[PDB]
């Protein structure tokens, strides 16, 4: 509709003026601008309600499932006969449905309101973990690899960032089995080498210590808890097919470039302060330059709107970051867990970056990407945030230039700068 | 300057709206971004390269030991510089 | 190890200050080309500058021949041209 309006107005102006590019830019008279017919205890309660807001989906789903389950088991008491009896007794598919009541469960419902000081918060937190086991497992795997830097703990995060975060809203059963069996194998081997009969040690990750199993019972238990929950609820060449199903499909479209670039900016803040706070500085300067390079490449991939390019770049990025961080740097300088908490934190922020890019690759770019990240609503906050974003050196500089280089435009650079400055001032 | 730009445009026109040439956009953007990242970064390179005094061995060439009871006179003074000053062998370091 | 006494003043608000100074100064200077660029857009987007060019050349020509009153009258015309953007739209309109 907007383009219909604009083309109508342009046709009217052409007809009126009826009565080779610089000529069309330098064609403006006053006949354009003439009127076209004008056409404090409550903080814990707030935290609990916010957690319930996060987990309302699983709460309602579990309520429906348990309401069904009570009648299901009370009928199963005798034999268990008809699948249609359990549905219609109290329309096969519908998310949130309401029918007659059962006295026992409705009596049990308000019992939680009896305990409301902290027990509500504990229940909400546990239910949040139950509603995000899929993310708890990724966080535990990444944390385990953040300590005990070793290839044995490096083959798994590469999988998490390359395969489990790209397939299908349910990462396939083969992946969970792979991670569970692999952590079985690589805790059994660690324990076997923990024996005293056997004498690189650190790189292969089979070293012997007092805490030889570190965040490895937690990782195994998280994997198994997720498998159990995904089992009780729900359902539990080839590479080319995997890629082709990744590209061509119907998906929701979401944009997370704001957060992706925000994670990269936090990452450079981390590099700057771990350079100033302490060899490795000769590694973090090169890493700072590569951060600039990967921000520029990511910005180009975003403007040009290529999901395939993002997939290739994210594979390259995850492989290169892991290999570099865990082999190249620990040889040029010290271990990454003995010291360099800055390195641990930088890796964690880059892991958030990788998860966001994987989500963006799964969901595919939307339409309507242009327009500033802060100028959607003219409230009293967007103005201060926009002024602050303008105040930092060399962003609007680079934002304007990179937005020009990769957008399809007919304007030269000076004209582009004029348009962008006019828009900033007018906003 | 404006007159020369108009004359150049008239001599070599551009049609009623064409994609700006990809090559010129890439070259100009690359040049500008390279400069704006050089200014951001090369200061850090110089600042963390000048403060890189590399480990260089500074072996004491002359050692002198004296034993002076009160303020009377050195009972025993000695200085051994070239031959008696010997560095470790690596295996001696392992022994230590 | 031995190091040249070229340490001077190190990091820890010693030398990071000069780097912040240089990055902020260059940031302001470079923003000089991108921030107030929209204002001087009535003096740099003229379609056809032939008439102003002839006026400037006539000021120079009449200054050349030791003829002076005409220089003041022509300068008056030029100043009133840059003092009235609607007449500098009338006066640099692309000739029909």
């Amino acid at each position: 509709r907007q383009m219909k309006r604009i083309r109508a107005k342009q046709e009217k102006y052409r007809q009126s003026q009826a009565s080779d590019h610089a000529t069309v830019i330098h064609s403006g008279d006053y006949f354009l601008f003439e009127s076209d017919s004008e056409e404090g205890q409550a903080t814990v309660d707030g935290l609990t309600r916010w957690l319930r807001a996060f987990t309302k989906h699983h709460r309602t789903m579990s309520d429906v499932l348990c309401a069904e389950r009570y009648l299901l088991t009370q009928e199963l008491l005798r034999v268990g006969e008809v699948r249609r009896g359990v549905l219609d007794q109290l329309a096969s598919e519908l998310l949130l449905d309401r029918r007659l009541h059962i006295p026992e469960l409705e009596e049990a419902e308000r019992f939680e309101a009896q305990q409301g000081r902290t027990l509500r918060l504990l229940r909400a937190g546990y239910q949040c973990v139950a509603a995000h086991s899929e993310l708890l497992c990724y966080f535990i795997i990444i944390l385990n690899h953040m300590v005990t830097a070793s290839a044995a703990s490096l083959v798994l995060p590469v999988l998490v960032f390359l395969w489990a975060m790209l397939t299908i809203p349910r990462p396939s059963k083969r992946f969970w089995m792979t991670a569970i069996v692999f952590t079985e194998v690589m805790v059994v081997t660690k324990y076997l080498f923990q024996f005293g009969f056997f004498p690189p040690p650190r790189i292969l990750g089979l070293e012997k210590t007092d805490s030889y199993i570190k965040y490895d019972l937690v990782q195994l238990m998280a994997l198994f808890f997720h498998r159990s929950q995904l089992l009780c609820y729900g359902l539990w060449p080839l590479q080319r097919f995997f890629h082709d199903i990744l590209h061509t499909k119907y998906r929701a479209a979401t944009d997370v470039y704001a957060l992706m670039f925000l994670a990269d900016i936090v990452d450079i803040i981390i590099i700057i302060f771990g350079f100033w706070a302490f060899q490795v500085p000769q590694a973090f300067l090169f890493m700072l330059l590569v951060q600039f390079g990967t921000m520029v490449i990511d910005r180009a991939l975003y403007l040009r709107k290529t999901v395939l390019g993002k997939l290739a770049f994210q594979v390259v990025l995850v492989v290169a970051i892991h290999i570099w961080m865990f082999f190249i740097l620990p040889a040029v300088t010290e271990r990454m867990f003995s010291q360099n908490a800055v390195a641990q934190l930088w890796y964690f922020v880059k892991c958030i970056y990788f998860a966001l890019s994987a989500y963006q690759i799964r969901c595919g770019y939307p339409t309507r990407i242009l327009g500033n990240f802060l100028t959607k609503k003219y409230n009293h906050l967007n103005l201060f945030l926009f002024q602050g974003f303008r105040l930092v050196p060399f962003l609007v500089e680079l934002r304007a230039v990179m937005d020009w280089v990769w957008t399809d435009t007919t304007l030269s650079l000076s004209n582009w700068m004029c348009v962008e400055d006019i828009y900033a001032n007018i906003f | 300057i404006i007159k020369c730009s108009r004359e150049t445009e008239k001599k070599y026109p551009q049609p009623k709206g064409q994609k700006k040439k990809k090559i010129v956009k890439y070259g100009m953007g690359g040049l500008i971004i390279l400069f704006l990242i050089a200014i951001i970064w090369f200061p850090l390179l110089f600042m963390s390269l000048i403060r890189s005094v590399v480990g260089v061995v500074n072996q004491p060439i002359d050692v002198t030991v004296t034993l002076k009871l009160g303020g009377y006179e050195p009972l025993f003074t000695m200085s051994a510089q070239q031959p008696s000053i010997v560095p470790f062998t690596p295996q001696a370091y392992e022994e230590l | 190890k031995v190091s040249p006494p070229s340490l001077g003043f190190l990091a820890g608000y010693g030398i990071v200050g000069l780097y912040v100074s240089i990055v902020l100064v260059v940031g302001k200077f470079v923003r000089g080309f991108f921030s107030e660029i929209s204002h001087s857009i009535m003096f740099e987007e003229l379609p056809c500058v032939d008439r102003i060019l002839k006026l400037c050349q006539d000021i120079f020509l009449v200054r050349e021949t030791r003829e002076l009153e005409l220089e003041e009258e022509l300068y008056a015309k030029l100043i009133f041209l840059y003092r009235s953007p609607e007449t500098m739209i009338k006066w640099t309109r692309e000739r029909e």
């Binding site: 000076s414 | 010129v24 070259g27 | -």
Partner: peptide, 21 residues
């Protein structure tokens, strides 16, 4: 690829920032 006009007008827009049109 490249050309002889491409570098020329790259230089044009590189002197187009500092100076007027």
């Amino acid at each position: 690829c490249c050309e002889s006009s491409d570098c020329l007008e790259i230089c044009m827009e590189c002197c187009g920032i500092c100076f007027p049109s």
